[PDB]
Amino acid sequence: RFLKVKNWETDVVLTDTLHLKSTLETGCTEHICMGSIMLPTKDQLFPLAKEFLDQYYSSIKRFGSKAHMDRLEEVNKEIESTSTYQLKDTELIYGAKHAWRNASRCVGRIQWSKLQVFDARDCTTAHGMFNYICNHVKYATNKGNLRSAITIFPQRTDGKHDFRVWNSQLIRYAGYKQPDGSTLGDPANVQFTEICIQQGWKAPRGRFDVLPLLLQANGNDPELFQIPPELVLEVPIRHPKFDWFKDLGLKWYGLPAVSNMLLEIGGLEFSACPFSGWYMGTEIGVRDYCDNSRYNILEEVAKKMDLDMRKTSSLWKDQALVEINIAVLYSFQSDKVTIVDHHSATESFIKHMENEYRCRGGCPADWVWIVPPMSGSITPVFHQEMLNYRLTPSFEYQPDPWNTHVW
Amino acid sequence: RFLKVKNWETDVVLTDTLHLKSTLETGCTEHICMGSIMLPVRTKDQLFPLAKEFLDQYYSSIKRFGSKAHMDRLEEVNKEIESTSTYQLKDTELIYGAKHAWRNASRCVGRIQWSKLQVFDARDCTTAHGMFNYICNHVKYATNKGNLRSAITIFPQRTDGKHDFRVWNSQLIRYAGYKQPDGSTLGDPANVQFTEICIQQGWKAPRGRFDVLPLLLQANGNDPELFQIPPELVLEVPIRHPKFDWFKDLGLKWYGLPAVSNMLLEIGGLEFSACPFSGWYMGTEIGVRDYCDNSRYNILEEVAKKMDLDMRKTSSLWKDQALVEINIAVLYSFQSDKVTIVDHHSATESFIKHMENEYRCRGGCPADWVWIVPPMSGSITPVFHQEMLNYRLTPSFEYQPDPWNTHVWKG
Ligand code: HEM
Ligand code: HEM
Ligand SMILES: Cc1cc(N)nc(C[C@H]2CNC[C@H]2OCCC/C=C/c2cccc(F)c2)c1
Ligand SMILES: Cc1cc(N)nc(C[C@H]2CNC[C@H]2OCCC/C=C/c2cccc(F)c2)c1
Ligand SMILES: C[C@H](O)[C@H](O)[C@H]1CNc2nc(N)[nH]c(=O)c2N1
Ligand SMILES: C[C@H](O)[C@H](O)[C@H]1CNc2nc(N)[nH]c(=O)c2N1
Ligand SMILES: [Zn+2]
Numbered sequence: 001r002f003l004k005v006k007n008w009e010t011d012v013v014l015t016d017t018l019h020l021k022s023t024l025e026t027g028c029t030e031h032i033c034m035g036s037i038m039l040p041t042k043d044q045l046f047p048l049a050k051e052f053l054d055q056y057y058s059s060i061k062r063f064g065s066k067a068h069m070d071r072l073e074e075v076n077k078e079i080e081s082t083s084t085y086q087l088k089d090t091e092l093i094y095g096a097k098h099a100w101r102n103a104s105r106c107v108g109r110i111q112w113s114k115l116q117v118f119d120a121r122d123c124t125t126a127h128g129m130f131n132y133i134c135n136h137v138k139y140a141t142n143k144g145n146l147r148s149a150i151t152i153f154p155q156r157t158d159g160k161h162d163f164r165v166w167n168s169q170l171i172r173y174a175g176y177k178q179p180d181g182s183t184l185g186d187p188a189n190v191q192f193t194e195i196c197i198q199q200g201w202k203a204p205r206g207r208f209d210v211l212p213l214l215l216q217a218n219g220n221d222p223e224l225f226q227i228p229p230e231l232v233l234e235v236p237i238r239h240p241k242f243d244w245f246k247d248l249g250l251k252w253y254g255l256p257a258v259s260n261m262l263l264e265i266g267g268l269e270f271s272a273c274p275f276s277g278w279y280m281g282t283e284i285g286v287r288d289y290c291d292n293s294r295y296n297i298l299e300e301v302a303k304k305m306d307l308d309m310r311k312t313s314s315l316w317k318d319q320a321l322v323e324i325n326i327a328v329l330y331s332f333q334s335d336k337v338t339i340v341d342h343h344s345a346t347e348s349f350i351k352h353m354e355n356e357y358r359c360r361g362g363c364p365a366d367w368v369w370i371v372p373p374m375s376g377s378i379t380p381v382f383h384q385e386m387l388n389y390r391l392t393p394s395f396e397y398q399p400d401p402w403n404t405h406v407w
Numbered sequence: 408r409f410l411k412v413k414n415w416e417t418d419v420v421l422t423d424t425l426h427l428k429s430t431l432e433t434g435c436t437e438h439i440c441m442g443s444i445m446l447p448v449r450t451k452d453q454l455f456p457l458a459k460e461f462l463d464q465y466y467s468s469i470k471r472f473g474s475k476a477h478m479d480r481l482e483e484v485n486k487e488i489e490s491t492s493t494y495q496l497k498d499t500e501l502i503y504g505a506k507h508a509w510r511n512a513s514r515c516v517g518r519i520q521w522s523k524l525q526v527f528d529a530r531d532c533t534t535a536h537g538m539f540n541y542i543c544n545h546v547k548y549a550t551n552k553g554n555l556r557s558a559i560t561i562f563p564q565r566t567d568g569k570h571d572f573r574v575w576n577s578q579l580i581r582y583a584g585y586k587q588p589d590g591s592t593l594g595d596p597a598n599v600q601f602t603e604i605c606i607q608q609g610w611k612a613p614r615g616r617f618d619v620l621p622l623l624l625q626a627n628g629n630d631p632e633l634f635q636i637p638p639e640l641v642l643e644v645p646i647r648h649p650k651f652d653w654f655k656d657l658g659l660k661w662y663g664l665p666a667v668s669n670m671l672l673e674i675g676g677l678e679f680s681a682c683p684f685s686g687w688y689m690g691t692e693i694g695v696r697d698y699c700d701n702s703r704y705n706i707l708e709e710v711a712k713k714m715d716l717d718m719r720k721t722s723s724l725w726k727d728q729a730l731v732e733i734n735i736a737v738l739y740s741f742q743s744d745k746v747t748i749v750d751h752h753s754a755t756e757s758f759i760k761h762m763e764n765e766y767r768c769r770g771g772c773p774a775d776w777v778w779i780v781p782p783m784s785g786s787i788t789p790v791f792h793q794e795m796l797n798y799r800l801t802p803s804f805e806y807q808p809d810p811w812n813t814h815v816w817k818g
């Protein structure tokens with residue numbers, strides 16, 4: 001019932017009790033581990049509300065106080081009456097920070113308590129959503145000195161009036177299917193790049209076209225907006241030693257900003273809640289640039305390096321991979337845009353693990369996601385046992401809105 | 408029921424029904440996933456059902472389920488259990504069983520090879536000298552002057568738990584580690600404690616960086632005994648780099664034969680506590696883990712120093728750069744000396760093909776993603792993008808506690 005996690009490099013053992021406050025189900029059983037699968041009423045609401053406010057009042061050292069009991073009744077009153085309730089500003093801020101703190105797949109949670117929360121619950125239209133989003137981008141970008149933030153649109157009501165950002169991230173590059181048969185730009189976004197065009201967007205049809213935002217207020221048809229280019233910080237990619245690297249014509253954006261998730265606080269659902277931090281180098285240089293079904297640039301780079309590409313065992317893919325990732329880090333650093341390498345990030349997360357065990361009784365962690373996609377075993381998280389479980393408040397996946405929207 | 412796994416690079420979707428034949432526990436529940444946890448005397452009562460499940464599987468595999476021969480063998484095993492408390496496997500059942508423990512090993516990326524396994528039956532063995540002889544023969548057969556062949560040697564099963572056959576070595580061939588008074592280590596740091604056991608048992612330690620450890624062998628629950636493998640039987644490879652001529656001067660070498668000797672083989676409820684098996688290496692086991700863990704040889708600094716990498720900031724990726732050069736060196740050296748090795752690209756590609764064939768012909772393939780994905784360059788190998796189901800089939804290999812923890816010393 002109390003579970004231990006060992007670090008095999010340091011022999012440090014931590015004891016996990018936080019898992020017993022676990023609520024939702026993992027996907028695993030006693031017979032099958034599902035650890036590597038990407039996606040495994042008034043009556044329901046008050047328990048959920050109570051559980052949250054209980055931890056809220058505990059956090060501000062006021063568990064069992066008049067104020068605690070008072071608010072528990074006010075919320076109970078409001079649910080019995082309206083079928084929902086509203087969070088106090090303070091509860092919203094605490095819930096958002098905690099959803100991040102509970103994200104078992106996020107290596108960057110050492111930062112969880114520095115999060116700027118933008119309350120957009122007063123928003124009513126897509127133009128409104130656009131204004132809120134530009135302001136988030138500008139704030140968070142901070143001319144290259146990136147700052148974490150989330151903007152929270154109005155909560156679900158009857159589920160026929162959802163606020164949704166249709167983009168998967170606030171800033172992403174377009175993908176187009178070519179007659180040719182190959183793909184121009186980012187193949188991840190082909191479908192969406194079409195939906196934008198199937199709605200009037202004028203595609204420059206380049207390798208790196210910043211997608212328009214596609215915004216849905218109150219369950220209405222969504223609308224297109226170009227983000228002002230002066231608000232999209234981008235970095236040209238060059239290598240500190242290979243003069244030819246620049247001629248690849250690669251660039252990436254400075255701000256990672258996930259916009260398709262659902263934030264759950266105290267039973268309430270915030271279906272539009274874009275949030276942003278700063279990149280770990282490998283996200284761009286390993287995944288965005290080198291995945292088979294992403295930009296897939298390994299061959300081109302290997303060639304320019306004149307490596308022996310005739311056999312897998314020359315490790316030419318591995319050599320090219322390192323150089324590409326050196327380029328990404330060097331570039332962002334040179335243009336003074338915040339970035340972290342996987343060494344410093346995983347080291348940070350280990351420190352964060354020790355803090356959460358020391359201070360909260362544990363830290364839910366998903367090893368499959370936490371371990372970087374390159375050089376796994378020379379980063380300390382490789383050797384660290386982790387326990388994965390689901391705590392609330394949380395971020396959750398949700399079906400892409402086009403599959404669902406009533407037009 | 409039916410479960411789906413998707414490959415997110417290819418969109419290929421596979422259906423698992425084999426997990427319905429799973430018995431043992433994973434360690435996970437609906438409320439916690441223990442997927443990254445490293446380690447998560449029987450009675451007649453429990454034995455005949457376990458015998459029965461196993462023989463139903465053997466007999467279906469040979470298309471004689473329900474045969475007279477199947478039924479007579481059930482009755483025969485039944486009777487042997489009630490009369491003697493245990494039973495003996497026929498040669499054919501033993502072979503089949505050891506192959507399936509390998510087939511079912513969900514942490515093993517090499518399983519495409521599962522059906523080509525040389526089985527050596529050492530169940531007539533009685534003494535530690537007998538074990539030494541059996542192991543030498545295994546090592547010579549498997550080595551095959553560099554053209555590695557997979558093999559397993561199987562010593563008598565557990566009886567009462569007081570008479571166990573054990574190989575005390577974690578692998579048949581490994582290098583000594585020696586803790587020095589100044590707190591530094593000579594040789595392999597993983598093997599310090601075991602080296603100390605060997606020394607106190609009477610081993611005269613050469614005390615260099617690559618001293619092949621003696622075998623410590625326990626027969627029939629008796630105190631274990633020391634033996635030196637004839638050095639002409641221990642194939643080793645000096646490590647050099649195709650472009651870097653200073654690489655050889657680091658003084659590195661490794662052995663060709665990876666041979667796990669500390670696991671337990673369970674077949675139809677029988678427990679074989681000494682069952683050394685061997686295959687051939689994936690280069691990253693040596694180049695990433697053996698040489699580059701901080702708790703192992705830890706050569707990253709020395710290598711990057713010679714490479715003149717910018718070592719002042721991790722963001723130069725000096726570690727990543729050196730790591731790749733060491734792994735190039737390992738594969739180059741083995742290939743140049745004609746010792747079988749596979750790179751992590753070719754081994755993970757073979758595994759996806761094996762895994763898909765297994766879904767098509769068997770209804771599933773249990774696989775542990777934490778173990779299957781290589782410890783460098785993970786996402787450029789096709790396994791990274793492969794959804795996997797982990798579960799426990801028997802026959803199987805299992806961990807067992809190190810025998811210096813449990814053994815009752817006799818003298
Ligand atoms: C401050 C710098 C941050 C770093 C370096 C970072 C790091 C990462 C990384 C590397 C991933 C893996 C993503 C992938 O591989 O596709 C990830 C996932 C995630 N992060 Fe962060 N993060 C940061 C800030 C944030 C913030 C501000 C939030 C929310 C407030 C957040 C919440 C999440 C969530 C929910 C996931 C998993 C999403 C999913 O399941 O697809 N992180 N994080
Ligand atoms: C033929 C070449 C083989 C290759 C390339 C190979 C590859 C590997 C690798 C890389 C590992 C993980 C090692 C680690 O990370 O420490 C492993 C684990 C394992 N393999 Fe193989 N393997 C081979 C043959 C075999 C054979 C012959 C058997 C037994 C019949 C076997 C059974 C196992 C088992 C039981 C594990 C898990 C060990 C543990 O949990 O500590 N493999 N395999
Ligand atoms: C706030 C933040 C900071 C950071 N450094 N990285 C991130 C993650 C961002 C940046 N890189 C990928 C993106 O993660 C989004 C999740 C990607 C997973 C793929 C995926 C998820 C669901 C369905 C599907 F088909 C694919 C977020
Ligand atoms: C038959 C076979 C073939 C092959 N290529 N590799 C292997 C695995 C071999 C070769 N390299 C590491 C070794 O695996 C050892 C397995 C045990 C895992 C290590 C381990 C487990 C618990 C605590 C600990 F400190 C270490 C076996
Ligand atoms: C199948 C597997 O679960 C999938 O490929 C995962 C593996 N680990 C990951 N880890 C991170 N950080 N991001 C990912 O997209 C993935 N993909
Ligand atoms: C804690 C974690 O489970 C442990 O370090 C695992 C991770 N994956 C591994 N994978 C392989 N192949 N070998 C290992 O020793 C490990 N170690
Ligand atoms: Zn699990």
